[PDB]
Design a protein around this nucleic acid. Structure first.
Ligand SMILES: Nc1nc2c(ncn2[C@@H]2O[C@H](COP(=O)(O)OP(=O)(O)NP(=O)(O)O)[C@@H](O)[C@H]2O)c(=O)[nH]1
Ligand SMILES: [Mg+2]
Ligand SMILES: [Mg+2]
Ligand SMILES: [Mg+2]
Ligand SMILES: [Mg+2]
Ligand SMILES: [Mg+2]
Ligand SMILES: [Mg+2]
Ligand SMILES: [Mg+2]
Ligand SMILES: [Mg+2]
Ligand SMILES: [Mg+2]
Ligand SMILES: [Mg+2]
Ligand SMILES: [Mg+2]
Ligand SMILES: [Mg+2]
Ligand SMILES: [Mg+2]
Ligand SMILES: [Mg+2]
Ligand SMILES: [Mg+2]
Ligand SMILES: [Mg+2]
Ligand SMILES: [Mg+2]
Ligand SMILES: [Mg+2]
Length: 450
RNA sequence: CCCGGCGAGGGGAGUGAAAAAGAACCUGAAACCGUGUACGUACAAGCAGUGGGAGCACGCUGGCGUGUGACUGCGUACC
């Protein structure tokens, strides 16, 4: 949670006019102690913050002379170029065959990441995927891959602990070339970088498969040893890329920076939940912005994921509002669809303009509130949903009693639907550019918060 | 919380000693306007009361108060 420390830091800087180099210094020190609190590659903390120090001395901006915009912009863009220079769109280069391996320390997230890639590339590539587990060591690891593969709808190549990993992956590659697959995901056992028999074993594995891609998997909570791990794995194995996992934790995962300092290999993907859908393309703009608290890249990516899962359902709510007008039917459809894409952190990060006025500790529980709405509007007869104005006291007693909640809550939800009804009408009558530009941010006077 | 137009206003709830203290806010008079009950009034002439007076209603403990006042004597405001 750098944003607590980095917020006091870079926000402190963004206050003071024509800042002395001393609070510049102190702020750098707090970024250092902040990344030190994040257990990111402590020597690489020192290096990074020395770089930020040298960069932050002589900048001038006519737009706004504020040095805090300079520290925020510098820390951002510098973490950006050090983390691979805005590589989101690029990802991995696809050839008609592709063979990718997942390697790294015990428990970093390799098996999970393999299935995430499977799902993601299954969606984007429109092609066929085969996966295989080279892990004969961890109990039930193969079964884990089989389960994940069955869940993501990806062909699974069987293997058991009684075999040799080389023979297994050789068989897998053979079957794959025979059955005309393209993307191949090979999940390997977790291993210490200082374990020679294992590292040799998978040097042999790589030698047998001849992969186009070797991906090192990093827990974002990985410590100072990262630079030592990445190098080791890059010296024997050598890796062509990096995946950074568990970024949904408060760990800042700048260890990958060390990993990208030694290796020089791009970081392709951000693991952002425990679910298969949780593979994101990595992007330094997104991780650095995510740290800083306000983001333009993650705003366009969460509005484009919301718009992708909600396209046919907002066109279903727009067709029913074209025929019967806006009802609790079109609203309820909006509710279930809205509950399926639901998350709060990907929503507040999309809007920096509203988060500048309100506390960043603001959270509505979407899983709670949304499903509550679905439930309450599941307690209405179809006439009350298509004709909401007839909902009365006894009706709200009935609705409140049906879902096992309070009448006040139902009042609140019908209030919400009232506001969204109005908004639907205002959107209907006015031109899109006028209705979007005429929205007012009200202060009861320019004096703030009152 | 409820009725209503996401109104006006209201009704519960809650604060308070008190909300017939609710911002159209201490006390809250008269004129003026009403809802409710008793009595009288649709063959009756006039400064509208006063003297007499039947009945009816309500209080009391067969009488005493209270309201009303059918019917008749006298009766043309104040400055
Ligand atoms: N929250 C979260 N959990 C993740 C992410 N990626 C992996 N995990 C989780 O981390 C745990 C370890 O993952 P696993 O795939 O077994 O890692 P592995 O590197 O294959 N382990 P091994 O070295 O034993 O083979 C699993 O619980 C899994 O669900 C992530 O991006 N976010
Ligand atoms: Mg594994
Ligand atoms: Mg009101
Ligand atoms: Mg009280
Ligand atoms: Mg008054
Ligand atoms: Mg007083
Ligand atoms: Mg008063
Ligand atoms: Mg009064
Ligand atoms: Mg009065
Ligand atoms: Mg006659
Ligand atoms: Mg008569
Ligand atoms: Mg007359
Ligand atoms: Mg008398
Ligand atoms: Mg009596
Ligand atoms: Mg008497
Ligand atoms: Mg009497
Ligand atoms: Mg008389
Ligand atoms: Mg006289
Ligand atoms: Mg006369």
């Amino acid at each position: 949670n750098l944003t607590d420390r980095l917020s006091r830091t870079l926000r402190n800087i963004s206050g003071r006019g024509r800042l002395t180099e001393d609070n510049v210094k102190d702020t750098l020190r707090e970024v250092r102690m902040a990344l030190l609190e994040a257990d990111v590659a402590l020597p690489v903390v020192r290096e990074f913050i020395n770089r930020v120090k040298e960069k932050a001395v002589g900048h001038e901006v006519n737009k706004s002379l504020t040095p805090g915009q300079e520290f925020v912009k510098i820390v951002r863009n510098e973490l950006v170029a050090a983390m691979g220079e805005e590589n989101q769109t690029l990802n991995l280069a696809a050839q008609p065959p592709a063979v990718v391996l997942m390697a790294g320390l015990q428990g970093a997230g390799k098996t999970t990441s393999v299935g995430k890639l499977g799902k993601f590339l299954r969606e984007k590539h429109k092609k066929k995927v085969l996966v295989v587990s080279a892990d004969v060591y961890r109990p039930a690891a193969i079964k884990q891959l089989e389960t994940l593969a069955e869940q993501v709808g990806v062909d699974f190549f069987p293997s058991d602990v009684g075999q040799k990993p080389v023979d297994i992956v050789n068989a897998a590659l053979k079957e794959a070339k025979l059955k005309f697959y393209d993307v191949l995901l090979v999940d390997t056992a977790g291993r210490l970088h200082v374990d020679e028999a294992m590292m040799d074993e998978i040097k042999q594995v790589h030698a047998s498969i001849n992969p186009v891609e070797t991906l090192f998997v990093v827990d974002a909570m990985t410590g100072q040893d990262a630079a030592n791990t990445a190098k080791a794995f890059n010296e024997a194995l050598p890796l062509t890329g990096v995946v950074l996992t568990k970024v949904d934790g408060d760990a800042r995962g700048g260890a990958a920076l060390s990993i990208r300092h030694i290796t020089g290999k791009p970081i392709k993907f951000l693991g952002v939940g425990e679910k298969t859908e949780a593979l994101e393309p990595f992007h330094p703009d997104r991780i650095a912005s995510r740290i800083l608290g306000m983001x333009x890249x993650x705003x366009x990516x969460x509005x484009x994921x919301x718009x992708x899962x909600x396209x046919x359902x907002x066109x279903x709510x727009x067709x029913x509002x074209x025929x019967x007008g806006f009802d609790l039917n079109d609203f309820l459809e909006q509710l279930r669809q809205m509950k399926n894409m639901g998350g709060x952190x990907x929503x507040x990060x999309x809007x920096x303009x509203x988060x500048x006025x309100x506390x960043x500790x603001x959270x509505x529980x979407d899983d709670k509130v949304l499903v509550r709405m679905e439930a309450i509007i599941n307690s209405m007869t179809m006439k009350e949903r298509a004709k909401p104005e007839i909902i009365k006291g006894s009706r709200k007693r009935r609705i409140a009693a049906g879902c096992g909640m309070q009448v006040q809550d139902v009042n609140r939800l019908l209030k919400q639907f009232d506001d969204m009804q109005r908004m639907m009408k205002k959107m209907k009558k006015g031109g899109x550019x006028x209705x979007x530009x005429x929205x007012x941010x009200x202060x009861x006077x320019x004096x703030x918060x009152x």
